[PDB]
C-alpha cells in the first residue's frame, strides 16, 4: 500500500501545485499569440498545442481524483475543472463546436488560491463581502421595473419599428441601452418622434427612475460602512462610563 503513500506524499506537495500553476500560466501565454488573418501554418501549430495542453491536464485531473473517491464532489473548483476538461474533450473528439472550447481560459483564476496569505488582499475581500445584500436587492427591484416597463413598451411601439421593440426579448435590450445613457436621443427617440409625436411622455420619466435608484445605491454604501465603524468606538463610551 506504499504506492498510495507515494501518491499521498508526492501529489500533496507544494512543488506540485507550484508546477501546475506555472503550467497554467504557460497555457495562457501560449494561447494568447493568436492573430488574424492567419497564414494557416500557425493553425496546425495551434491545434497541436491545444491537444498537448489538454492531454496533460487530463492526466493531472486523473491523478488528482485517484487519491480520493468521495472526498470529491465537495468544492466547486474541482467540479468546475471537470466541466472545463470535459468540454475540451468534447471539442477534441466531435466536429466543429469551435467557440465552445473557449471556456478553458478561466483556470488562471486558480491563482487566487495562491494569494490567500497576502495581508493586502484581505481588506479588499472583506470590503467585497460587505456590499453584497444591497446589490442583490437592487438587482431584483430594477428587474421588476424592467418587467413593468417592457411590456408597455412592446404594446405601444410594436406595429411600426419592429427591430427595436417587436418582442419582449429585444425590448429588454433596448431599455438596457437607454438606461446606461448611450445615444438615447440621437439614435432612438429622434426617429421615434417623427412618427409618434408623443414618445417623450414615455422615455423621459423612465430615465429619472433609474438615475434616482443608482444614486441611492452609492450613498447607501457610504452610510452603511460608516455606520458600523462608529459602533467600534461606541463600546469605548462604555469604557468612558467610569470616567
Amino acid at each position: 500500500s506504499h504506492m498510495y503513500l507515494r501518491i499521498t506524499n508526492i501529489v500533496e506537495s507544494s512543488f506540485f501545485t507550484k508546477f501546475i500553476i506555472y503550467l497554467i500560466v504557460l497555457n495562457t501565454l501560449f494561447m494568447a499569440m493568436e492573430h488574424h488573418p492567419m497564414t494557416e501554418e500557425f493553425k496546425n501549430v495551434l491545434a497541436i498545442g491545444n491537444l498537448v495542453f489538454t492531454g496533460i491536464f487530463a492526466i493531472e485531473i486523473i491523478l488528482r481524483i485517484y487519491v480520493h473517491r468521495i472526498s470529491f464532489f465537495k468544492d466547486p473548483w474541482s467540479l468546475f475543472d471537470s466541466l472545463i476538461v470535459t468540454l475540451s474533450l468534447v471539442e477534441l473528439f466531435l466536429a466543429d463546436v469551435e467557440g465552445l472550447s473557449v471556456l478553458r481560459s478561466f483556470r488562471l483564476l486558480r491563482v487566487f488560491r495562491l494569494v490567500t496569505a497576502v495581508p493586502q488582499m484581505r481588506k479588499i475581500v472583506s470590503a467585497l463581502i460587505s456590499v453584497i445584500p444591497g446589490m442583490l436587492s437592487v438587482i431584483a427591484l430594477m428587474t421588476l421595473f424592467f418587467y413593468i416597463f417592457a411590456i408597455m413598451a412592446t404594446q405601444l411601439f410594436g406595429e411600426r419599428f419592429p427591430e427595436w421593440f417587436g418582442t419582449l426579448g429585444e425590448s429588454f435590450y433596448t431599455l438596457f441601452q437607454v438606461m446606461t445613457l448611450e445615444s438615447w436621443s440621437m439614435g432612438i427617440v429622434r426617429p421615434l418622434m417623427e412618427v409618434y409625436p408623443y414618445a417623450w411622455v414615455f422615455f423621459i420619466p423612465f430615465i429619472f427612475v433609474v438615475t434616482f435608484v443608482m444614486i441611492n445605491l452609492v450613498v447607501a454604501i457610504c452610510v452603511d460602512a460608516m455606520a458600523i465603524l462608529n459602533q467600534k468606538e461606541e463600546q469605548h463610551i462604555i469604557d468612558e462610563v467610569q470616567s
Binding site: 496546425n44 466531435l94 466536429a95 466543429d96
Partner: peptide, 30 residues
C-alpha cells in the same frame, strides 16, 4: 481507401461519408 473516424488524415487520404479532415477524420453533427 477513405479514412475512418479517429484516424489521422492529410490532403490525399480523404475521409469517408459525413466527416471532416481536420488533421484526422471527425464525424459531424449539428
Amino acid at each position: 481507401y477513405c479514412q475512418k473516424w479517429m484516424w489521422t488524415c492529410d490532403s490525399e487520404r480523404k475521409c469517408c461519408e459525413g466527416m471532416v479532415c481536420r488533421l484526422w477524420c471527425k464525424k459531424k453533427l449539428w
